[PDB]
Amino acid sequence: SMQEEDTFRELRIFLRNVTHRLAIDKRFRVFTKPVDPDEVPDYVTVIKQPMDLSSVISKIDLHKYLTVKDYLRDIDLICSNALEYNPDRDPGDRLIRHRACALRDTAYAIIKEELDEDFEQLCEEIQESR
Numbered sequence: 852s853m854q855e856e857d858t859f860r861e862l863r864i865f866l867r868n869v870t871h872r873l874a875i876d877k878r879f880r881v882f883t884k885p886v887d888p889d890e891v892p893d894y895v896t897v898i899k900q901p902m903d904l905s906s907v908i909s910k911i912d913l914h915k916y917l918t919v920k921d922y923l924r925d926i927d928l929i930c931s932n933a934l935e936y937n938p939d940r941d942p943g944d945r946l947i948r949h950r951a952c953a954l955r956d957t958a959y960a961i962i963k964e965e966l967d968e969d970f971e972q973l974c975e976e977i978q979e980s981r
């Protein structure tokens with residue numbers, strides 16, 4: 852129905868605003884664009900499902916997220932990919948892990964404060980009806 856289309860459109864506006872706030876944070880610049888295979892040829896071989904915030908915006912605009920849970924699965928991937936690719940004790944790897952955990956924690960904290968639980972439940976119910 853048009854009302855369900857309206858619901859998904861509101862979800863996309865909400866997710867674009869959360870993603871823009873993460874992308875303009877200086878700590879998260881490394882996560883804003885895909886890893887360049889030139890610098891990092893082993894990346895695409897270790898990480899089977901690369902994810903970054905520009906990919907997330909593209910997904911929003913392709914109507915790939917129909918619930919905030921689906922979006923948070925991709926934010927979790929940005930985090931877990933960085934934990935897996937950069938697991939060493941050296942400071943460059945620790946800095947990327949800390950920035951990835953902080954992204955993820957920031958996204959969840961904005962959603963806890965600003966997503967109405969009944970809106971998420973509505974999205975879940977429309978998704979499940981498809």
Ligand SMILES: C=CCNC(=O)[C@H](Cc1ccc(O)cc1)NC(C)=O
Pocket residue numbers: 944945946948949952
């Ligand atoms: C799970 C998300 C966060 N990751 C982190 O804790 C990172 C890196 C780290 C990870 C394990 C260590 O034993 C020591 C450092 N930042 C810190 C705590 O400086």
Ligand SMILES: [Cl-]
Pocket residue numbers: none
């Ligand atoms: Cl830096």
